[PDB]
């Protein structure tokens, strides 16, 4: 077995997996907890780190240098860019970026800083892993980039803007930031999001009716990757 | 003595400690560099976090989980929305936000997410220790707010809007996000900027004028304040 950590933004999106595990013990550190349970061979670390890159950075980083974590997995929600994903459909990232870092003015591409890149690419063994539980329990899932940022997108004209510049399948909050501190610390890293909104006018809606229930399919997925690891 | 973290975004900010220190060793971790360094009693861990909110999150992280640090003092340049402000003067974050985390399509306030709060407090006893240092050495400091995000500003209409929303005397890419690190692990922050520029028109150029000089000027002054800790 190994330590493996489970990383959500939101109390909805790993409540449902500690419903599941039931027996775990708590560690508070970081402003935050941290929740610590068995599962087959493997030592589970998770948490929800509050939203947004800097608070999903934080979390990442105490769960691999305090809590030991071997492997990384992220799950939550998203908002979906590409016109063929669904309110439900689970979207895991080959690569990620950050739409608003910007230091453009100075004749960079948008979301790059010296000694980075623009994208920051996820774990192809865990990748193809993913591949082989969506197969076994017949569930649908695409491949696709990640754009990441500390705004929630609600507005036609940003999603489409965002889509065009990075080849976006889907917006969040945290991937990115996770996917760094991974990839930073030598830790292999997958992100997992099913999709919560379409990012457009009413999102904000769709996300409030459709939050719960697709908060639980992408958590549902990695504890069953917990199974094949 | 104690362990103390000087943290900077940019080569520029932290090389002048570097050149004055002259016996120092490195490590390579984090995908960074982070330089060693006996200073009177101190132990000092040194770095550039390289730009931006993620970065400088995540070398925060580590220089307290990883390397021990007990106090971080933050060293560097930035954008001045206060008219009194000249470039090359020095101010401290009494109190830090992040202008560009929003989720203000729910409701809440620009700059808040839930758990945590509009602005993020520095250390007291380190502000009052460099008001201290400011009198010994004749220097002018100001306290102030400081606005931090992902943006190079460099729009008067951009400077005027973060300003009257934060009450921000200035604005650059690292200082809440190290501030919240630091409070979150219970170790005391100081966050000082030297005014590179005033985050109008011509922000870009003013700031490739006044980098090196404005970060030697910030950095001498968190080495005296190494001496009096
Ligand atoms: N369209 C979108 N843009 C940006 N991000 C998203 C997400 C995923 N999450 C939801 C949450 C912000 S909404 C939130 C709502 N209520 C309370 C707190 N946060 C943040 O963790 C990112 C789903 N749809 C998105
Ligand atoms: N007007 C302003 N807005 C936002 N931030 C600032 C700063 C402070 N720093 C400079 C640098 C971005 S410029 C940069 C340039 N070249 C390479 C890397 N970064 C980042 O660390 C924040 C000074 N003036 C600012």
Not at 128 to 148: D, F, P, Q
Not at 192 to 200: E, P
């Amino acid at each position: 077995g190994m330590k493996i950590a489970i990383l959500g933004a939101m109390s909805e999106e790993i409540t449902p997996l500690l419903e599941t595990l039931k027996d775990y013990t708590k560690i508070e550190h970081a402003n935050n907890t941290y929740y610590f349970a068995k599962y087959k061979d493997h030592e589970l670390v998770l948490a929800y780190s509050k939203i947004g890159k800097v608070n999903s950075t934080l979390s990442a980083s105490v769960m691999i240098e305090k809590f030991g974590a071997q492997v990384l997995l992220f799950t939550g929600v998203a908002g979906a860019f590409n016109p063929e994903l669904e309110i439900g459909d689970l979207l895991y990232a080959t690569k990620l970026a950050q739409y608003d870092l910007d230091i453009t003015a100075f004749g960079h591409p948008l979301g790059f800083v010296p000694g980075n890149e623009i994208f920051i690419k996820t774990d192809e063994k865990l990748n193809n892993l993913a591949l082989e539980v969506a197969k076994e329990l017949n569930i649908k899932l695409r491949a696709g980039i990640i754009a990441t940022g500390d705004e929630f997108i609600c507005d036609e004209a940003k999603k489409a803007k965002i889509r065009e510049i990075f080849n976006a399948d889907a917006c969040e909050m945290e991937g990115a930031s996770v996917a760094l501190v991974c990839d930073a610390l030598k830790v292999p890293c997958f992100i997992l999001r099913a999709m919560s909104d379409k990012a457009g006018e009413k999102a904000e809606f769709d996300f409030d009716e459709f939050v719960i229930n697709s908060a639980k399919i992408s958590a549902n997925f990695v504890l069953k990757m917990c199974e094949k690891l």
